[PDB]
Amino acid sequence: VHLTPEEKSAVTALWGKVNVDEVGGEALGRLLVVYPWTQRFFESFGDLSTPDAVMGNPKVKAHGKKVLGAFSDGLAHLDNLKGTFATLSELHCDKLHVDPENFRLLGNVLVCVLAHHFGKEFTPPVQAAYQKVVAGVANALAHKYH
């Protein structure tokens, strides 16, 4: 994850704007709605049976917020994504046994969510930069499998 001054300019300018209150619950909800086998990991959480149930679940919007944290984290330490994510990688790999592919899918729904939210400002060059980052994180989370 190397990022040019301009990519970094495109990522951090955008991310400051981001409603860290809601977007994190949008991403997670949409992940559980669009790719339903992931609900297997949140059967607790609760009423997940219809798209409306999922999006109005206190517990979905609360956790998604935790998840965006780890994401603002990585933005900080792009030079060192692995050390940053090492305890989470242990968690998702060894304790949960989440297939790494779903790290990708979350990355991509998060990018849809930033597209939905920012519209025209989420230009192709700004999407390209975010996919690099998203791939960076997914790769970091996955490390404990390697």
């Binding site: 949409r30 597209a115 939905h116 939210h117 999407q127 996919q131």
Partner: protein, 141 residues
Amino acid sequence: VLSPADKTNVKAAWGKVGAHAGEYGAEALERMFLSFPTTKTYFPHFDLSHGSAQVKGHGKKVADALTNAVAHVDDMPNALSALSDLHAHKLRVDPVNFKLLSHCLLVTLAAHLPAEFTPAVHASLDKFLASVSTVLTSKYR
């Protein structure tokens, strides 16, 4: 496999896209090429810069096929079978690249229709884009 709900949703979202589907396709291609540079290798002859005329041109054609699929969603194999031979048989298109483009298509649609890009509809559009992709690579499989 697509439910009766997903059909309604795809037609709803499509109609809304309207006479802008050409432009949307060009943009979704542009996103792909920038975000996933590996896809570029298949287009050695195009000029892939921003305002490229071959990218606009190709974006309409992509858009026109997806509209045929939608209008023929209950018979996509017949509708699209020619394009499957093209993609899965002559150009030998790595199937991973159908994922990347479906992704960029969704991003483009989310960038354009904040009212209609709801969760249920994002789910339907994913499914419909996965459907089309299963048919375009079927000669493989």
